[PDB]
Amino acid sequence: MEVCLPNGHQIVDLINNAFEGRVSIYSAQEGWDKTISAQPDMMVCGGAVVCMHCLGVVGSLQRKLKHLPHHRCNQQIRHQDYVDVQFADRVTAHWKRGMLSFVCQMHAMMNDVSPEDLDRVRTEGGSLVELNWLQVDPNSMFRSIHSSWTDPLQVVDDLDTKLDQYWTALNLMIDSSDLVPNFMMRDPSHAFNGVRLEGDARQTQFSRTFDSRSSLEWGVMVYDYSELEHDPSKGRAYRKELVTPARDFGHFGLSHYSRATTPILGKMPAVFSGMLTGNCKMYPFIKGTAKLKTVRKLVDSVNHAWGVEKIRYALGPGGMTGWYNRTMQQAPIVLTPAALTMFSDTTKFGDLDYPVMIGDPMILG
């Protein structure tokens, strides 16, 4: 049963999903459930069901598959040839679950502030909620030498629905009381090149992606607004006018604009799509050109294993190498979630005034 390679746009799709941790993987051990890691046997690439042993299309989403279809498999695609994608996908999956636990944590606390405490901060300012960063996803590959990316994915039912719900609830509260969070950024790119660091946070080394070439285990980074409180001319009134998120992002419930967090986990800021865009989706702030590199090893692997015409007729002009190049030039468009280029142009307060340090996430007035 002869099989063909997938088309360019289907590999672009694989990559886009990987960086949302939603690639549909099938292993003979665990089936279509990727909660427990196992070597991929098949992966869904833009509708097509691809064999991870030859990278041939052996099915589609239309007909259900319980096993890897019997096919004439060249068997020359090695695990090492596509693990970069598998890594990207699994790590993002671990990352989203980690980010969720963090959001819930802030939510619950914020949703417990006594009406008195709230009102006091509304009037004079000062701390309202503080989370010990040591408690932010303590046993993830991002916070412990013992954990690995191959570890089981924390089973979370309705991950995306909760992420949407909680992030919304949290931000609506932060907005109605003109509060100030120390875990948000107007432009996440400032995290890698802009904000000034203090404490241990100074040695931070941003890979700016999710790959197995730079430790992803690190601390929870947030803003140190301490010196702001101290400042006389920057009291409550000041905060209400420039610091509260609404001033730079717009009022949460009335904006399309995305909001980003500071590097809370995996030295990777999170971007949340605006509320009026439909729902609040979360995406890691990784460049498209970076995402594409996860298939760099696969290109050579395919070129070595498949026939010239087969590669040309499936991947298009320039074969798969050509596809890779043409895609690299389009990365900003074809490999970039819309939310990443949806930040408010106008920014009063900004991200460059106070320093970022490994510390406790918190909401204050």
């Binding site: 049963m1 002869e2 063909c4 390679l5 088309n7 360019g8 746009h9 289907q10 672009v12 833009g46 509708g47 097509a48 299309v57 026939g307 015409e309 087969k310 040309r312 007729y313 499936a314 298009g316 002009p317 043409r326 895609t327 030039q329 389009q330 900003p332 468009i333 074809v334 280029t341």
Partner: protein, 266 residues
């Protein structure tokens, strides 16, 4: 030449194509604040004004083989707070530059440009309130590779469709990236050249075409794509089998068993 047969035209809306599907399109990335006004003359020396900015798309002429383009802005609006398409002019501009289109941001990178054709638009009121409807157009351009005479291998050939005007077009008035949100009809100007997914090939391997196109890819292929041709040759076989075969659902026949044989061994 041997594989090809008389081709048929194809329709596209360059604006709604996916650039990761139609390998013959290039685009200036949005969100970069890219925006620059330029000036180009037509073959009669007349100077024209138009803007290139984030979102602007062009057709990569190189490698598509002889091809005729006809653009129909009929039905579209393009009406903005400070821009009325009625009486305005649109044109086809052909660029010749060594710099890749995606990288453009300043007028200095466009190399050699010529407005090759233009028409004046007529707008009225459409069934949709507050919207203006542009009259049917037939802006044409024939891409003849031999006329361009590409020499320098680093030369890129681009095709654009935007508003052109005798007066500088104020960027905040007319904000559209181009007028590619229209009906484009491509017609091969040769039946001896064949392409595969956007680019010319000197020869085809029919059997490797089998099962290698996604619906997206087929739809985005050029009118002279080998697949399209394979399909028209194959349909004569389908027609033949039907003249002889009166088999009902699930009934075998002399024309179905050949597959059964392959399946049996497979």
């Amino acid at each position: 030449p041997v594989f090809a047969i008389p081709p048929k035209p194809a329709d596209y809306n360059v604006r709604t194509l996916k650039i990761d599907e139609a390998t013959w399109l290039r685009m200036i990335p949005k969100t970069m604040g890219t925006l620059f006004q330029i000036q180009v003359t037509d073959n009669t020396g007349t100077n024209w004004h138009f803007n290139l900015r984030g979102g602007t798309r062009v057709v990569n002429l190189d490698q598509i083989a002889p091809m005729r383009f006809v653009l129909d802005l009929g039905g579209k609006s393009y009406k903005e707070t400070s821009w009325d398409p009625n009486g305005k002019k649109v044109g086809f501009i052909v660029f010749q530059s060594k710099i890749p289109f995606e990288l453009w941001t300043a007028a200095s990178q466009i190399g050699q440009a010529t407005v090759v054709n233009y028409v004046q638009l007529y707008a009225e009121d459409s069934s949709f309130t507050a919207q203006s409807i542009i009259a049917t157009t037939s802006l044409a351009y024939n891409y003849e590779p031999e006329q361009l005479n590409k020499t320098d291998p680093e030369m890129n050939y681009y095709l654009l469709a935007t508003f052109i005007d005798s007066a500088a077009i104020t960027p905040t008035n007319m904000t559209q990236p181009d007028v590619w949100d229209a009906l484009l009809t491509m017609s091969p100007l040769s039946a001896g050249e064949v392409t595969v997914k956007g680019a010319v090939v000197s020869e085809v391997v029919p059997a490797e075409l089998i099962g290698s196109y996604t619906p997206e890819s087929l739809n985005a292929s050029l009118p002279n794509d080998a697949a399209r041709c394979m399909i028209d040759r194959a349909s004569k076989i389908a027609e033949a089998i039907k003249i002889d075969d009166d088999a009902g659902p699930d009934e075998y026949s002399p024309n179905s068993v050949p597959i059964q044989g392959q399946l049996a061994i497979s």
